[PDB]
Design a protein around this ligand. Structure first.
Ligand code: SF4
Ligand SMILES: [Mg+2]
Ligand SMILES: [Mg+2]
Ligand SMILES: [Mg+2]
Ligand SMILES: [Mg+2]
Ligand SMILES: [Mg+2]
Ligand SMILES: [Mg+2]
Ligand SMILES: [Mg+2]
Ligand SMILES: [Mg+2]
Ligand SMILES: [Mg+2]
Ligand SMILES: [Mg+2]
Ligand SMILES: [Mg+2]
Ligand SMILES: [Mg+2]
Ligand SMILES: [Mg+2]
Ligand SMILES: [Mg+2]
Ligand SMILES: [Mg+2]
Ligand SMILES: [Mg+2]
Ligand SMILES: [Mg+2]
Ligand SMILES: [Mg+2]
Ligand SMILES: [Mg+2]
Ligand SMILES: [Mg+2]
Ligand SMILES: [Mg+2]
Ligand SMILES: [Mg+2]
Ligand SMILES: [Mg+2]
Ligand SMILES: [Mg+2]
Ligand SMILES: [Mg+2]
Ligand SMILES: [Mg+2]
Ligand SMILES: [Mg+2]
Ligand SMILES: [Mg+2]
Ligand SMILES: [Mg+2]
Ligand SMILES: [Mg+2]
Ligand SMILES: [Mg+2]
Ligand SMILES: [Mg+2]
Ligand SMILES: [Mg+2]
Ligand SMILES: [Mg+2]
Ligand SMILES: [Mg+2]
Ligand SMILES: [Mg+2]
Ligand SMILES: [Mg+2]
Ligand SMILES: [Mg+2]
Ligand SMILES: [Mg+2]
Ligand SMILES: [Mg+2]
Ligand SMILES: [Mg+2]
Ligand SMILES: [Mg+2]
Ligand SMILES: [Mg+2]
Ligand SMILES: [Mg+2]
Ligand SMILES: [Mg+2]
Ligand SMILES: [Mg+2]
Ligand SMILES: [Mg+2]
Ligand SMILES: [Mg+2]
Ligand SMILES: [Mg+2]
Ligand SMILES: [Mg+2]
Ligand SMILES: [Mg+2]
Ligand SMILES: [Mg+2]
Ligand SMILES: [Mg+2]
Ligand SMILES: [Mg+2]
Ligand SMILES: [Mg+2]
Ligand SMILES: [Mg+2]
Ligand SMILES: [Mg+2]
Ligand SMILES: [Mg+2]
Ligand SMILES: [Mg+2]
Ligand SMILES: [Mg+2]
Ligand SMILES: [Mg+2]
Ligand SMILES: [Mg+2]
Ligand SMILES: [Mg+2]
Ligand SMILES: [Mg+2]
Ligand SMILES: [Mg+2]
Ligand SMILES: [Mg+2]
Ligand SMILES: [Mg+2]
Ligand SMILES: [Mg+2]
Ligand SMILES: [Mg+2]
Ligand SMILES: [Mg+2]
Ligand SMILES: [Mg+2]
Ligand SMILES: [Mg+2]
Ligand SMILES: [Mg+2]
Ligand SMILES: [Mg+2]
Ligand SMILES: [Mg+2]
Ligand SMILES: [Mg+2]
Ligand SMILES: [Mg+2]
Ligand SMILES: [Mg+2]
Ligand SMILES: [Mg+2]
Ligand SMILES: [Mg+2]
Ligand SMILES: [Mg+2]
Ligand SMILES: [Mg+2]
Ligand SMILES: [Mg+2]
Ligand SMILES: [Mg+2]
Ligand SMILES: [Mg+2]
Ligand SMILES: [Mg+2]
Ligand SMILES: [Mg+2]
Ligand SMILES: [Mg+2]
Ligand SMILES: [Mg+2]
Ligand SMILES: [Mg+2]
Ligand SMILES: [Mg+2]
Ligand SMILES: [Mg+2]
Ligand SMILES: [Mg+2]
Ligand SMILES: [Mg+2]
Ligand SMILES: [Mg+2]
Ligand SMILES: [Mg+2]
Ligand SMILES: [Mg+2]
Ligand SMILES: [Mg+2]
Ligand SMILES: [Mg+2]
Ligand SMILES: [Mg+2]
Ligand SMILES: [Mg+2]
Ligand SMILES: [Mg+2]
Ligand SMILES: [Mg+2]
Ligand SMILES: [Mg+2]
Ligand SMILES: [Mg+2]
Ligand SMILES: [Mg+2]
Ligand SMILES: [Mg+2]
Ligand SMILES: [Mg+2]
Ligand SMILES: [Mg+2]
Ligand SMILES: [Mg+2]
Ligand SMILES: [Mg+2]
Ligand SMILES: [Mg+2]
Ligand SMILES: [Mg+2]
Ligand SMILES: [Mg+2]
Ligand SMILES: [Mg+2]
Ligand SMILES: [Mg+2]
Ligand SMILES: [Mg+2]
Ligand SMILES: [Mg+2]
Ligand SMILES: [Mg+2]
Ligand SMILES: [Mg+2]
Lengths: 96, 208, 82, 99
RNA sequence: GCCGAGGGUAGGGCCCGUGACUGGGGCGAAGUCGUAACAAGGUAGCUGUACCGGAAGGUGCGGCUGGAU
RNA sequence: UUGGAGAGUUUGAUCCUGGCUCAGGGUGAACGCUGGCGGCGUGCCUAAGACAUGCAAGUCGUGCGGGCCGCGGGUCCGUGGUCAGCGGCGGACGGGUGAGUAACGCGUGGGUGACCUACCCGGAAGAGGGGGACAACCCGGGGAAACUCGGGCUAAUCCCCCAUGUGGACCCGCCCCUUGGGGUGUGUCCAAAGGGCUUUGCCCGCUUCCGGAUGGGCCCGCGUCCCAUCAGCUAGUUGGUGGGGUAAUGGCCCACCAAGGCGACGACGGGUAGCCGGUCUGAGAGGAUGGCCGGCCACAGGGGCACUGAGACACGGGCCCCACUCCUACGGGAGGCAGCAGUUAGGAAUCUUCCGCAAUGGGCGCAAGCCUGACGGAGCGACGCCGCUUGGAGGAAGAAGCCCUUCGGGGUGUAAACUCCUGAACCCGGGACGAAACCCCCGACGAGGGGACUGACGGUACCGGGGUAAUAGCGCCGGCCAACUCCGUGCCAGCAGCCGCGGUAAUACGGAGGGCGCGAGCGUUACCCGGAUUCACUGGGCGUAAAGGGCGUGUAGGCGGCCUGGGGCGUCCCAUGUGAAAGACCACGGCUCAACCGUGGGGGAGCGUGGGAUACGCUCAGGCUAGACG
């Protein structure tokens, strides 16, 4: 009338919290950056972006995002950001 | 199982003597030698000409009732030779012959095939050494078929080898009498064996 | 891992293995990658074990993993030899 | 090899897309005779350079859109309206087949 | 907040089972009525159509020979 | 060239057309009568209706901290067994079923510069320094139960920050390539864990990256049933742009923009079916089929959805809704056999609540070892195939009984009786093969050599000794079609696949004698192919037998004269890749044979690629006048 599949569901819920938690943050700082570079304000935009990329590749280390996901996310992060600076500029930090 | 019943009614129907007992087949107490006409209430009436189908069934039971063989084993043995290379007729006869229960009899180990069965099924026979109690063994060239030593001192097999002292046995078989051992040289050409049977007609029975 | 093991053929009370390379996740007698010999545990034939040894080594050099009673059958046919 | 087909453009009424009809002959599997069957493909003309009646070559490519799986390889011939009219007239005959 | 299993309201399409009663159909048969067809079948037959008659059918119009002499 | 039989029936008779019917092989069969043994297969085809009970997935103390009990011995330690917990790996394999699906589901040949892969191998490099949570546990509250919330502490291979950057990722630039592939420079971002022995040395693991191997996702060409009495279908529809999303392409999803996409070469719709290797039949061509077994797919009470994850939108995991059943302490809560058995319902119909991890295989583990209804065997069922038995030799011009008779006799019938010979069954003794690995040993934990432990089936098969004459049934006997007489019946009773039998001498009904055919079987019903050249590709027809459109004109389509060249599409050849395994076939070999099973051999179409051929059909080009028109 039971087993260890219960143990495994209890585990799945605790990892669930951790996964969502990063994703919201990751998506939070991503928008926060892209938000800034649009009205850039290049330096702050570029600065916050470094905490985006950081928080991304760390998520990539585990179960959160697979390798190609983090890559996919950054290429849409940066490409959006830099070209938003082409509407003004200039890129005050790195990078790159 | 096998036919296992009154056997003179068999020859009487076929119109021909088949040698289904042994000793009595030769004496004048043989049924065909008293009544060469089909058994039962209507045997002495004048026959009516049998149809093609009538003729073939009859030639089949002829060859078949010789061997004391079931229709299944007959059919399957036949439907082997139908598939396997060459001329069907000879091979069917050949594969018919390679039966142990037949082989035992052609050598004169037994007086009938019916006795050659009880000889085989009661283990009194051996093939190249090993005891064999299977009437259906397909004996192959080079096989040496002999009596078991443990039964070699039996009235029936001793007495039945007594006739065989210099008796003829078909070309493809050799026989060390007294020593109680024989040898299978090869499967027959239609010539070697003169069964009272037109073998082509059996193919044609089955072509229907 | 891709594994080397004995897919059972033959018949009841008549075992007959095919030493083979198949996915570890396959069913024991399922479709395999390559056949590399046979094995007859009843030894009722002159040669109850034969192995193309050059082939088995290809897999080993690349990561196939023998079962215990296959590891032995390769040892008896001396694939492990130096 | 990426299957390359030869056929006629019969409609270019979309942006960056052509309709390349490909035809084929083979003998009828039971009745022997060689028979004509054909098919329309949507081909990616990114360079929107191809016109009605062009005979071209197309190559199976990675998916562009739904349905679109071929890009146009190269021009083969120009101005074969006689063929487009073959296609176009069979359509016009469909009106006389209803109720 | 969107989409959303499905629940609910309303109107449509195809199919199936069934229905007082009704239309002809098959078979059964030892029934009633007539005798239309097969002989020139006793008005040559068949025919599309039209009108009519208890029923086979008849008649008009045109057609066919697959009509005896 | 290993391969091909036909008959009955329209007539007074004939020839022909045409159907009906039959003899064959086959089945996951069922039903009737009958039934002895064994081997190998094989067994809910119906309600993917509903299900009591047990069992089908766990494992690791060589990751961590504990509670209890014990051996040890000084409240403490080592250590053992056990129970949960945290953390790993597995649970996406294996096993079931065919509902749904006419579809890129499957089959076959290919694309991926548009992609992923835990454990495994190989190649390069690394493991430095801190911090923190939640269960266990203690303490409260609430129940019959499911159990449940709160408060407080604690360890780690549990989470997090910094450092190192072999390497990787991303944006911008250049080169190479050519769909997002390879290379590099500026910038920025990302690593990690210890455990254990024999202890400055090894073993299991960890981290980043590259290659390999294996398993997948996605895409394309071609092939895949019936109704045209379904003829027109389409708004995410078809394409573009920009984003969202994923490992990845894509209307997969959203916004905007364009007016498009599909269809008689059958769209849309309705019906039916999971597809294949193959199986069955057939001379072949073809037809029929997809149970067992192997491959793929789909589903897990009916639907929807995601989470954890390398991998699932997950049969024995989660959430929700519905239908259904249950338990209760009446306040509330639980279940999902299309896993193995088993119950029930439906049905003409389809099994033991077995034994075992010994073997093969899978999962966890350094290893011992633990789990394994996968599997190995056992049980039941003539369901199928195969082997086998109910005895063999002798024995009368031939017992009795019964059948027939011209009353002379004919038959069952060597059949029986009886004589000898053999010895299924059973009794006694021996007794397997399947099982040598892991481990241990020396060596080096390797190469190699040596050692011991292990058998559910089973005291079974088999081997040896003894020993009893030891089950036969079922269909048919008018023609097809093999086998005939007497009585009883009197168009009655009944038989029947077709033609036909029965109205007082029925070989056709019922019994008997006799006979014919098979034999632990024989018949019957149902269905598939054959006979049916009766959908005719092989291989048919249309004056009167069924069958020429009432006649024109013309759309698509099918088809096309004589000569020459270009191409080489159809077509032919060659070389190569693929065409898995089982099965089929040929040889051999193992079970005493066989069924069954093992080993080897031989191929094919069909498709991918390369090269060649150019007569015919194709295409393009240039001529001609015999076809056609003027
Ligand atoms: S006796 Fe004559 S009939 Fe009776 S069996 Fe011997 S041969 Fe045949
Ligand atoms: Mg667990
Ligand atoms: Mg927010
Ligand atoms: Mg995930
Ligand atoms: Mg990751
Ligand atoms: Mg003779
Ligand atoms: Mg003749
Ligand atoms: Mg032959
Ligand atoms: Mg003779
Ligand atoms: Mg035949
Ligand atoms: Mg088409
Ligand atoms: Mg697009
Ligand atoms: Mg809705
Ligand atoms: Mg609705
Ligand atoms: Mg609701
Ligand atoms: Mg009605
Ligand atoms: Mg009515
Ligand atoms: Mg009525
Ligand atoms: Mg009249
Ligand atoms: Mg008249
Ligand atoms: Mg008249
Ligand atoms: Mg008239
Ligand atoms: Mg009146
Ligand atoms: Mg009138
Ligand atoms: Mg006229
Ligand atoms: Mg020929
Ligand atoms: Mg025939
Ligand atoms: Mg008649
Ligand atoms: Mg007539
Ligand atoms: Mg008549
Ligand atoms: Mg006929
Ligand atoms: Mg039959
Ligand atoms: Mg029965
Ligand atoms: Mg019974
Ligand atoms: Mg059995
Ligand atoms: Mg079922
Ligand atoms: Mg019901
Ligand atoms: Mg019910
Ligand atoms: Mg158990
Ligand atoms: Mg460990
Ligand atoms: Mg333990
Ligand atoms: Mg534990
Ligand atoms: Mg599974
Ligand atoms: Mg499965
Ligand atoms: Mg199974
Ligand atoms: Mg199905
Ligand atoms: Mg459909
Ligand atoms: Mg495909
Ligand atoms: Mg398709
Ligand atoms: Mg494929
Ligand atoms: Mg620490
Ligand atoms: Mg701490
Ligand atoms: Mg760092
Ligand atoms: Mg049609
Ligand atoms: Mg796009
Ligand atoms: Mg769409
Ligand atoms: Mg839109
Ligand atoms: Mg349906
Ligand atoms: Mg179905
Ligand atoms: Mg035929
Ligand atoms: Mg089918
Ligand atoms: Mg079936
Ligand atoms: Mg299957
Ligand atoms: Mg479903
Ligand atoms: Mg159910
Ligand atoms: Mg459900
Ligand atoms: Mg469901
Ligand atoms: Mg995992
Ligand atoms: Mg995924
Ligand atoms: Mg699960
Ligand atoms: Mg689930
Ligand atoms: Mg699923
Ligand atoms: Mg279940
Ligand atoms: Mg309960
Ligand atoms: Mg209460
Ligand atoms: Mg509740
Ligand atoms: Mg239960
Ligand atoms: Mg019932
Ligand atoms: Mg049952
Ligand atoms: Mg079974
Ligand atoms: Mg085991
Ligand atoms: Mg094991
Ligand atoms: Mg291990
Ligand atoms: Mg267990
Ligand atoms: Mg069990
Ligand atoms: Mg089993
Ligand atoms: Mg007499
Ligand atoms: Mg007599
Ligand atoms: Mg008498
Ligand atoms: Mg008498
Ligand atoms: Mg006798
Ligand atoms: Mg053993
Ligand atoms: Mg005795
Ligand atoms: Mg019969
Ligand atoms: Mg017959
Ligand atoms: Mg007769
Ligand atoms: Mg009476
Ligand atoms: Mg009478
Ligand atoms: Mg009769
Ligand atoms: Mg009678
Ligand atoms: Mg038998
Ligand atoms: Mg039967
Ligand atoms: Mg038929
Ligand atoms: Mg035909
Ligand atoms: Mg024809
Ligand atoms: Mg005809
Ligand atoms: Mg005419
Ligand atoms: Mg008209
Ligand atoms: Mg015309
Ligand atoms: Mg034309
Ligand atoms: Mg033409
Ligand atoms: Mg020409
Ligand atoms: Mg030419
Ligand atoms: Mg060509
Ligand atoms: Mg080939
Ligand atoms: Mg093959
Ligand atoms: Mg042999
Ligand atoms: Mg062949
Ligand atoms: Mg030429
Ligand atoms: Mg010309
Ligand atoms: Mg002219």
């Amino acid at each position: 009338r039971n087993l260890s599949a219960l143990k495994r569901h209890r585990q799945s819920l605790k990892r669930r919290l951790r996964n969502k938690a990063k994703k919201s943050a990751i998506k939070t700082l991503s928008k926060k950056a892209i938000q800034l570079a649009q009205e850039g304000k290049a330096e702050e935009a570029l600065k916050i972006m470094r905490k985006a990329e950081s928080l991304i590749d760390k998520a990539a280390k585990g179960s959160t995002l697979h390798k190609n996901a983090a890559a996919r996310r950054k290429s849409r992060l940066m490409r959006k950001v830099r070209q938003l600076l082409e509407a003004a500029g200039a890129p005050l930090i790195g990078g790159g | 199982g096998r036919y296992i019943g009154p056997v003179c009614r068999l020859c009487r129907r076929e119109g021909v003597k088949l040698y289904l007992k042994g000793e009595r087949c030769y004496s004048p107490k043989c049924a065909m030698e008293r009544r060469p006409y089909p058994p039962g209430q209507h045997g002495q009436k004048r026959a009516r000409r049998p149809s093609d189908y009538a003729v073939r069934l009859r030639e089949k039971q002829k060859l078949r009732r010789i061997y004391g063989i079931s229709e299944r084993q007959f059919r399957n043995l036949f439907e082997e030779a139908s598939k396997k290379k060459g001329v069907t007729g000879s091979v069917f006869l050949g594969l018919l012959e390679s039966r142990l229960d037949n082989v035992v009899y052609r050598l004169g180990f037994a007086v009938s095939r019916r006795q050659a069965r009880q000889l085989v099924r009661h283990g009194h026979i051996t093939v190249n050494g090993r005891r064999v109690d299977l009437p259906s063994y397909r004996v192959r060239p080079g096989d040496e078929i002999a009596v078991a030593e443990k039964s070699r001192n039996l009235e029936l097999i001793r007495q039945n080898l007594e006739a065989m002292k210099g008796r003829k046995v078909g070309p493809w078989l050799s026989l060390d009498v007294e020593g109680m051992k024989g040898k299978f040289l090869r499967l027959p050409d239609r010539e070697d064996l003169a069964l009272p049977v037109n073998e082509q007609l059996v193919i044609e029975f089955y072509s229907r | 891992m891709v594994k080397i093991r004995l897919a059972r053929f033959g018949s009841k009370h008549n075992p007959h293995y095919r030493i083979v390379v198949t996915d570890a996740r396959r069913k024991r007698d399922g479709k395999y990658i390559e056949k590399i010999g046979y094995y007859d545990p009843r030894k009722t034939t002159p040669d109850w074990l034969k192995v193309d040894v050059e082939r088995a080594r290809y897999w080993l050099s690349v990561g196939a993993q023998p079962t215990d009673t296959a590891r032995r059958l390769l040892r008896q046919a001396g694939v492990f030899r130096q | 090899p990426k299957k390359v087909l030869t056929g006629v453009v019969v409609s270019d009424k979309m942006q960056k897309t052509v309709t390349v009809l490909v035809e084929r002959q083979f003998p009828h599997p039971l009745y022997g005779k060689v028979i004509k069957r054909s098919k329309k493909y949507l081909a990616h003309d990114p360079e929107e350079k191809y016109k009605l009646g062009d005979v071209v070559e197309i190559i199976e490519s990675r998916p562009i859109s739904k349905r679109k799986r071929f890009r146009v390889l190269r021009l083969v011939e120009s101005g074969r309206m006689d063929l487009v009219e073959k296609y176009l007239i069979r359509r016009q005959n469909y009106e006389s087949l209803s109720k």
